[PDB]
Every structure is written in C-alpha cells, then in structure tokens.
DNA sequence: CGCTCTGCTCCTTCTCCCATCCTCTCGATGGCTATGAGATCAACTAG
DNA sequence: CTAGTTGATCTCATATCAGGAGAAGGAGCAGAGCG
C-alpha cells in the first residue's frame, strides 16, 4: 500500500487503479486534510474527479486517521442528475461505506430527518441536492459533518443566492468543490467559491473586488494606460499565487498524452440581417425606448431581450408562406437552411442549440416545414423521460438533428452520436456556450466534431460574443497565465445599442479587433522589489 | 412598521386600474432601496455607494 | 496673572399656526421589466 | 400501496413682494472669582 509522509495508508488495490494525475490529486486532498483546509478540484470535465474523492475518502477511512476514529459523517451536495451515479461509484470502489441518498425517490421510506439522524449516527456517506441544503439548512446542519463536498460547486458562484448561504452554514474545516470551472463570468464567482472552501483566505468581497476585479478588468482593455495594464498584471500574479495551494486545476494539455482526443475545429459565421429584420432592428434602436434606456429612466434589460429577439427572428419581437416563424425572414435561419441541407446531404448528425426556447420552438416548426427527422429535449420535457431520448438519438442514425437549449439536462448529457453542432445564438456566459460545444465533443467521440456559432454582424449578438470572449479572456488570465495580449476597447465593448451592419467593403468588427491573427533575505528582497517595480 | 391595507387602501378607478396610496408608493421606494442596499452590502459595492 | 465659569444680550434658525359649514365645475390620474432551467411537492391517473 | 405524469411554486441566471410669534442654540463678551 502506498504511504504518505505522516502516514495515510491509501490501499494498494485502489491506489493502483488511479492514474498519475489522480494520485497527485489524492495527495493534494490529503495535504489539505492535514492543514485542515478546503480546496477546489478545478480539473476540467472528463478527467475524473469523483474517482479521486472516493479514493481519498476510502483511504482516510481505512487509514483510521484521527476526534473521529477514521472518516466521520460526510455530506455530498451534487445536482440531482448525478446523485445515483455517486452511490454506484462508492459501491463499486469502496463497498463498506454505508452510502445513502436523501431524496423523494430515495430508499428510506420514512421521515427524512430520521434518515439524517441515522446516517450521522453511523458515520455514513450522505448525498443531497442543493435544494435540500437550502430547505433543511437549519436541520441538516446539526449533526457535526466531517466533510462537505459540493460537486459542481459552481452552483455557489453567486455570493447572494440562498444556496450559497445554506452551503456556507456548514462548520467543518473540510470543504471540497468539484467544478469544471471555478469562475464563469467574473471574479464574483471566484470569491464566492473561495469564501466557501476557506472562509478567511481571500478577504471580504468588497476588499477583494477593489483590489483584484476592477484593476484586472481595467487592464483587460487595449486602450488602457501602461500603468493600468502593469498593475493588472501584478494583481493577477498576487491572486494567482494566493490561490495556488488551494485550487488544483489541470487542463487537457498535460494529460492529453494519456487519453485520446479527436481534433475539433470551430468557426464563427457572421450572418447578415435580412432587410426586414434590419429595418425592425433600426426602428428599435431609433425608437424612444432605447433613448429612455440611455437616459436610465427604463431598465436596459428589456431592450437587451428585445434586440436579442430581433436578431433571432423578427416574429419573436413583432409577433401561405407567411405563418409564424418563417425561416426566410432572418439571415441566421437562412444559414441554418444551408447548413442543414448540406449536412443532411453529407449524412452527418446535428446538434441545434439556442438559448431561447421560443426560438427553439420556431426552429422545430421550421424543421417540420422541412422533411428532416428530429428529436427535441428542453426544459418542458419531464426529467424522468430525458434519458430515453438521448439514448434513442445516440444509438441509431434514423434521427438527424437534436434540438437543445444550452442549459437543459444535467451537465454533459452524453450526446455522442452527433457529428456537427451549431449554436444558433450566443449567450452572455462563456461557460454555457463552452458547455454546448463540449457536450458533443467529449470522451469517446468517434468522429471530428465542428462547432459553428451563428452571429449577426454589427448587432447585439456580436457584442454578446465579444463579451463572451472578454469574460473567457479574464478567466484565462486569472487561471493559466497573466501575460496576455490585450483585445478590446472599453467604450466599444460596453456600448451595445447600435447597428453598423457590414457592407462587405470593410471587415467585420471581430476581425478588425482580431486583426493581427529559510529565505536568506535577498531572494525575499529581490522578489519584493521585482513585484513592486511592475 | 408597514401599515395594513386599511391605512393605505388601493382604490379601484372607473375601470380596472387599481390606484395605490401615497403610503404604498413610498413603501415601494423604501423596499426598493432596502433590497438594493441589502444586495450592495452582500455583494461588491464601494463604501461611498453604500453610503 | 491667566484661566474658568458663568450669565447677559444680539442674532439666527426653526417650527408652529393661520373661522365654520355648504355647492358646483374642471384637469390629471392610467405602470408594463423578459425568459428559461432545476427542484420540490401535491395532486390526479393509471397500475 | 407505487410509479408516472402534470401543474403550481420557488430559486437562480445573464444583461448597466404685504407673516408673525415664540422657543432653542449659539456666539461675543463683561466680569467675577480664584488658584
């Protein structure tokens, strides 16, 4: 059996099964357990983070380290769609853990409070949903939990949500987060996650923002004064080394040689607005509503929703060959016509993504107007019948296009039989579109998958994509390397109520922006003066 | 203390438009700024903004 | 021999009040953000 | 009793001039003790 420095006898017949990065992760988790601190397994999806957690907890139970003779009661807060998976994983790796699910489905068939009491009384392994943490936040937190594992802990990304407060009402030193991305939009989410795992390490959120978030974003613009970018680099370095020993994040660059990965290509099509759609958009951006938005007298949010609706299709905003949702009145639907026809002639299989469920229904009606066989899964479908549809799409070839919104289903529902994917409209979060493209291109994908993002040039959608890239750049700067070539302008990025459609004489805004493509008190002093000159 | 509905009755006009009392409009402002202050203290806000 | 403690005066805010009851016309007042997904639960609808 | 389906219900995201009269505070200050 493998043995660590202080003595943590992870069993040989489990430890041998792990991969090198998995064993490194178990080492890191147990270093945290010795320091009595929490962490974030920020390894991206597909590497396997549940295996690391069960291996580490099993070693902690067999090693009988101690308070508690070995491992005590632990709570795992995960989305419903994976709860049963978790128990099966335990039951196949380490059987003697009395694992139990808290759910209406469940297995207890009695009062749930009795389940919490009984499981804690046996030092069991208890799995919940985030909603049960929120609802029983006073009840579930009375039985001296030894570990808290927030699987997909990006549910805590908001420092305001009641789930965040209910999850931060736990008392143990041991807080582990299993999230594919600690931050998705901005540094609010990084702060919230670190406030969970380690209450004191990063400062109070005001302090954190005023020190890190504002300088970094101010240095994320290409029109920033040199002092601003240098301060942003320094502050990013400080945040990086502050979070270094508590965020274990591994990419698919170092671990790529261990597992295969088919090549992925991606294009961003810029779909010109149709003349009627262009007229409607120009009338809205000239109407008094956007003027009141610019005055601040009305919520800008409704104008955003309206312009997104216009760029999707005029029939959304406005409300034979003239029925609801005719595909000839929006240029993005023209390109979807061309791509769907060509891909059907190629015999491939398509994922059709869109943030709007109404335009998802419009796309359904369009597909019915054509003769493409298809299958739909969205939020309106019952969850108990979600797994069949996916399976029926993945097993046969007699279904051509599968319809999604970016945010339906559990994280990473296995849509492997698809070959091509089209994202009909961009979202504000880079992570939801990254998840959309990732869902088709996962482990065990047989053929080269390509993603086509559909944009309308010079419109709100182009600015949504620009914001998405900007947030992705911020996340990358924080998480992998601070030095980064600056792409954007502060005013152009934030002003998003104009219409400059290209005439093909001049290039599009995106291509114009992307036009180029003990210490001995002297090392200590050298590092201090180095950081200070920046 | 927010008073009951009797102290600030919502009188219905000739049609269906329910007009609210001055107290109700003021309480709406108070709840708006109270929630706004609650989030600004809970999430990122400058000291002068909270002030 | 300079400090403190009055307490007098002059000004300054500041805040309160301005009869009772009755009739009639006439103008203004109207408040709407969106959308979607996850989850729980409680009720039917079969078994 | 047991699932399965279906509504309600709730949580969480992403957008940037023709007054007056009195009361209270305050300030300048004269002067008296007095250490």
Curated annotation (Swiss-Prot), chain A:
Domain Helicase ATP-binding: 30-200
PTM characteristics: Phosphorylation at these two sites promotes the intramolecular interaction of the N-terminal domain with the helicase ATP-binding domain, thereby probably releasing the inhibitory effect of the N-terminal domain on its ATPase activity. Phosphorylation is essential for its chromatin remodeling activity. Ubiquitinated at the C-terminus. Ubiquitination by the CSA complex leads to ERCC6 proteasomal degradation in a UV-dependent manner. Stabilized following interaction with KIAA1530/UVSSA, which promotes recruitment of deubiquitinating enzyme USP7, leading to deubiquitination of ERCC6 thereby preventing UV-induced degradation of ERCC6 by the proteasome.
Domain of life: Eukaryota
Short motif DEAH box, span: 151-154
Cellular localization per UniProt: Nucleus; Chromosome
Residues where ATP binds: 43-50
Domain Helicase C-terminal: 335-494
Intervals of motif CSA-interacting motif (CIM): 521-533
Disease per UniProt entry: Cockayne syndrome B: A rare disorder characterized by cutaneous sensitivity to sunlight, abnormal and slow growth, cachectic dwarfism, progeroid appearance, progressive pigmentary retinopathy and sensorineural deafness. There is delayed neural development and severe progressive neurologic degeneration resulting in intellectual disability. Cerebro-oculo-facio-skeletal syndrome 1: A disorder of prenatal onset characterized by microcephaly, congenital cataracts, facial dysmorphism, neurogenic arthrogryposis, growth failure and severe psychomotor retardation. COFS is considered to be part of the nucleotide-excision repair disorders spectrum that include also xeroderma pigmentosum, trichothiodystrophy and Cockayne syndrome.
Subunit and interaction comment: Homodimer. Binds DNA. Interacts with ERCC8. Interacts with RNA polymerase II; interaction is enhanced by UV irradiation. Component of the B-WICH complex, at least composed of SMARCA5/SNF2H, BAZ1B/WSTF, SF3B1, DEK, MYO1C, ERCC6, MYBBP1A and DDX21. Interacts with KIAA1530/UVSSA. Interacts with ELOA and CUL5; the interaction is induced by DNA damaging agents or by inhibitors of RNA polymerase II elongation. Interacts (via WHD region) with RIF1. Interacts with SMARCC2/BAF170, SMARCB1/BAF47 and the neuron-specific chromatin remodeling complex (nBAF complex).
Function: Essential factor involved in transcription-coupled nucleotide excision repair (TC-NER), a process during which RNA polymerase II-blocking lesions are rapidly removed from the transcribed strand of active genes. Plays a central role in the initiation of the TC-NER process: specifically recognizes and binds RNA polymerase II stalled at a lesion, and mediates recruitment of ERCC8/CSA, initiating DNA damage excision by TFIIH recruitment.
Family that this chain belongs to: Belongs to the SNF2/RAD54 helicase family.
Gene name of this polypeptide: ERCC6
From Swiss-Prot, chain B:
Taxonomic superkingdom: Eukaryota
Post-translational modification (record): The tandem heptapeptide repeats in the C-terminal domain (CTD) can be highly phosphorylated. The phosphorylation activates Pol II. Phosphorylation occurs mainly at residues 'Ser-2' and 'Ser-5' of the heptapeptide repeat and is mediated, at least, by CDK7 and CDK9. POLR2A associated with DNA is specifically phosphorylated at 'Ser-5' of the CTD by CDK7, promoting transcription initiation by triggering dissociation from DNA. Phosphorylated at 'Ser-2', Ser-5' and 'Ser-7' of the CTD by CDK9 (P-TEFb complex), promoting transcription elongation.
Locations listed in the record: Nucleus; Cytoplasm; Chromosome
Role noted for this protein: Catalytic core component of RNA polymerase II (Pol II), a DNA-dependent RNA polymerase which synthesizes mRNA precursors and many functional non-coding RNAs using the four ribonucleoside triphosphates as substrates. Pol II-mediated transcription cycle proceeds through transcription initiation, transcription elongation and transcription termination stages.
Record comment regarding domains: The C-terminal domain (CTD) serves as a platform for assembly of factors that regulate transcription initiation, elongation, termination and mRNA processing.
Subunit structure: Component of the RNA polymerase II (Pol II) core complex consisting of 12 subunits: a ten-subunit catalytic core composed of POLR2A/RPB1, POLR2B/RPB2, POLR2C/RPB3, POLR2I/RPB9, POLR2J/RPB11, POLR2E/RPABC1, POLR2F/RPABC2, POLR2H/RPABC3, POLR2K/RPABC4 and POLR2L/RPABC5 and a mobile stalk composed of two subunits POLR2D/RPB4 and POLR2G/RPB7, protruding from the core and functioning primarily in transcription initiation. Part of Pol II(G) complex, in which Pol II core associates with an additional subunit POLR2M; unlike conventional Pol II, Pol II(G) functions as a transcriptional repressor.
Similarity comment: Belongs to the RNA polymerase beta' chain family.
Protein name: DNA-directed RNA polymerase II subunit RPB1
Native organism: Cricetulus griseus (Chinese hamster)
The organism's taxonomic lineage, starting at the top: Eukaryota, Metazoa, Chordata, Craniata, Vertebrata
Gene: POLR2A
